[PDB]
């Protein structure tokens, strides 16, 4: 297809960012409704941390990227996971591989 | 197989947890001496290969550069590096591909332990390979060539998240390196079949399903953030994004080169900046059956690729993708 | 799967509406960028009407649902259609069938 | 075949265009007398069938109701009506399915013209069938049964857009009818194969691709508006949405019954309220090949359905969906 260039490229990128930001927010909103309905354990970072390491080798020192990364993964990516203990095993698996 | 080599070869009271453990073992002195010697030997080997790369790249007129190859597992990253970064291809030829910063480059060596055979699994060696890559990377940060110029280096990792991308940008800016970033995407199912084609006797990693799916999600969701870094700062270096067309061919999708931003394939760009998630969707439970094998084969025209795809898939026929990769990953 | 009921159902529906309204707006925004880039003829309802009937048998008397229906179809559904004359044949086809 | 039967059988200077033409011919007096007599005869037949439906439905205790069957072409609407609206199923049994408001019910009769053979195409008769359905519907608006109660009626049309849905709600409210709406969805490709399975000797319509794709887009984009009408007004009647699972089975997805709103399948609900569009995507150009036939067959377990799907598809193998439906539609 024809290459978008100059201002058309920039406007496509700006509109696409807005689309994907709506999708990002929506995925988590809808996942949280579903999780409430099925009685999924409420996400709690401190409890999860007692049973797996979420630091990425201490590369993640913040809790704002950190809570945001894991709570979103918990609800959006793993809707059938009902408990933090289950999720912990998933996080451990993620950090056993590049 | 359970116990990690960090646990097996670490000396004494190992801090539990993550950080604590990470710092403790970050000290080469907390390892049994034979293990410390193996570490030294692998780092010297990696270092010699990285210097070979850097002297090649400088001789071919490349200013000090951090070549970052972003993208999920088994997306065709190596083939893009080879074909679409001709200066780096020329360098990697001299080292047979060695010298890049990537924990996986240490795993075969740590898993054999100079014994002659693989006796630890990839997962068993991962923490230790990660500590070595960090030490290797730390020694390259201000490494110079024979001209006194900062050495070019290659970071071959998924590089999915903003914190990682920011850290490497900072390293580049602090050491006067440009960032040359090629970002490579394939559909999640292509990565899954890519992983089942990787043979245990090879050195490419064979992770289980969650690694590949969560990698996919992270790489796609954070992609536009990485592009925005290049759009905002023309001096940072260059960015190119390659995606996969229906027939499996890689095509240019978007780029920021010499500050100029262009979208070479707007349809793919729309698609590969999103993880295409739904509230309960599960590819993990999809069963590998004849039609799935035929559906993948229908879009693969190359004979060698098609045959290898097919044989890898038939080996796990009847299993879900999650069961197939979990079984594949458990091989040594 | 478990049925969403009561407030969970209503909140799912409300969030989903917001998602699809973002998607609706985005599809047209991105289509208009693309159309500009490829030099697609600008949508003009009056000219289109000279060459096909858009009324649905006079059931569409308004021009706010009417412009909105066709301009969106033109840009979003038929991105490879470059001209209103081409589009006209499409609209005629639509109204030849239930 | 070109000229419409409205043009062929209309008397005199026909207004050109749409409205103008519509009003002119809305007058039964602007037709040749033989054609006017055929109109009368078809409307009397339809009327007798609709009254049979209404007396059945009232005898089974159904208050005056507008049963509206919303959804795109060849989505399995008739099967849902039959199985999931038992009172209406009982009525339609007595008329062999006749009596509903739908232009297509007149087409076979107008296309034969009492000649004994189909000599006009569906497109050639569509405008005239639309004028008859409007006249039929207009005479049913205040039609009563033998008890003096307003007759129940069935509107079998795509009903995709807000203006249409609003018009039928207004008709219901003005004539004291409840609205019983079943909204039926299938993926676009299921409608496309559904259309190629419809035989020219049958009376079900065989439209070309744009009708089916633009129908899909309109029905999905406006669906939540229709649901909101029921959520907002419990007295309006009841709404049920049926979607298609992977194996082709219809399942309940959302409902508003007795004012109560529930989402029986939230994953499907997310999916079937969106048209899944992209800036340049084109299913219209997808070619029907062995693997597409096998990919569809893989999710069809019923033998009769699978065989009919297969034979319809093989007839157009090698053609794009757009070429296949255009060729299929051109048969008389």
Describe this structure as you would to a colleague.
The PDB classes it as protein binding. Keywords: avrrxo1-ORF2 avrrxo1-ORF1 avrrxo1 avrrxo1 required chaperone 1, effector proteins and molecular chaperone, protein binding, ATP. The complex is a heterotetramer, with two copies of chain A (98 residues) and two copies of chain B (332 residues). With 98 residues, chain A is mostly helical. Chain A has one domain. Chain A is 64% helix and 0% strand. With 332 residues, chain B is of the alpha/beta class. Chain B has one domain. Helices cover 50% and strands 11% of the residues of chain B. Chain B has 15 helices and six strands. Chain B has a six-stranded mixed sheet with strand order 2-1-3-4-5-6, with helices on both faces. In chain B, a hairpin with a 2-residue loop joins strand 5 and strand 6. Chain B is globular, with a radius of gyration of 20 Å. Chains in contact: A-B, A-C, A-D, B-C, B-D, C-D.
% residues in beta strands of chain A: under 5%
Helix tally of chain A equals 4
Helix vs. strand class of chain B: alpha/beta
Specify the helix fraction band of chain B: 40-55%
Largest sheet of chain A: none
Number of DSSP E strands of chain B: 6
How many individual domains of chain B? 1
Strand order of the largest sheet of chain B: 2-1-3-4-5-6
Return the structural class of chain A: mainly alpha
Shape label of chain A: extended
Gap from first CA to last CA of chain B: 10 Å
Largest interface: A-B, 41 and 50 residues
Q: Kindly, what is the distance between the CA atoms of the first and last residues of chain A, rounded to a whole number of angstroms?
A: 35 Å
PDB class: protein binding
Keywords: avrrxo1-ORF2 avrrxo1-ORF1 avrrxo1 avrrxo1 required chaperone 1, effector proteins and molecular chaperone, protein binding, ATP
Assembly: tetrameric
Entry title: CRYSTAL STRUCTURE OF AvrRxo1-ORF1:-ORF2 WITH ATP
């Amino acid at each position: 297809m024809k290459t978008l260039t100059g201002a058309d490229a920039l406007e496509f990128h700006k509109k696409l960012k807005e689309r994907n930001k709506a999708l990002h927010a929506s995925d988590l909103e809808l996942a949280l409704v579903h999780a409430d309905a099925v009685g999924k354990e409420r996400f709690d970072l401190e409890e999860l941390e007692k049973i797996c390491d979420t630091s990425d080798a201490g590369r993640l020192t913040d809790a704002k990227e950190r809570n945001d990364i894991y709570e979103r993964m918990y609800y959006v990516e793993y809707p059938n996971v009902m408990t933090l203990k289950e999720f912990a095993h998933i996080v451990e698996t993620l950090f056993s591989w590049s | 197989q359970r116990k990690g080599t960090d646990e097996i070869y670490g000396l004494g009271s190992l801090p539990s947890a993550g950080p604590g453990r990470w710092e403790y073992l970050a000290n080469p002195g907390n390892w049994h001496p034979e293990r410390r010697k193996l570490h030294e030997k692998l780092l010297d080997q990696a270092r010699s290969s990285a210097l070979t790369l850097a002297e090649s790249l400088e001789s071919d007129g490349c200013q000090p550069t951090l070549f970052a190859l972003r993208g999920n597992t088994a997306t065709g990253k190596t083939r893009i590096a080879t074909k679409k970064i001709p200066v780096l291809a020329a360098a990697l030829k001299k080292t047979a591909g060695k010298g890049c910063v990537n924990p996986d480059v240490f795993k075969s060596s740590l898993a054999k332990s100079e014994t002659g055979a693989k006796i630890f699994s990839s997962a068993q060696v991962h923490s230790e390979s990660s500590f070595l890559a960090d030490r290797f990377e730390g020694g390259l940060r201000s490494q110079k060539t024979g001209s006194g110029a900062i050495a070019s280096i290659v970071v071959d990792k998924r590089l999915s998240r903003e914190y990682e991308i920011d850290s490497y940008i900072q390293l580049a800016k602090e050491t006067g390196r440009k960032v040359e970033l090629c970002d490579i995407d394939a559909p999640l199912e292509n990565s899954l079949v890519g992983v089942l084609q990787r043979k245990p006797e090879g050195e490419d990693p064979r992770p289980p399903y969650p690694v590949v799916s969560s990698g996919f999600v992270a790489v796609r969701s954070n992609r536009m953030y990485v592009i925005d870094r290049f759009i905002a700062d023309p001096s940072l270096g260059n960015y190119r994004l390659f995606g996969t067309a229906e027939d499996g061919e890689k095509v240019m999708v978007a780029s920021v080169i010499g500050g100029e931003f262009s979208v070479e394939n707007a349809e793919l760009y729309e698609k590969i900046t999103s993880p295409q998630l739904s509230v309960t969707g599960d590819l993990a439970d999809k069963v590998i059956d004849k039609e799935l094998i035929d559906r993948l084969e229908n879009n693969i025209a190359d004979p060698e690729r098609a045959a290898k795809t097919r044989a890898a898939l038939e080996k796990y026929s009847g299993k879900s993708w999650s069961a197939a990769l979990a079984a594949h990953s458990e091989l040594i």
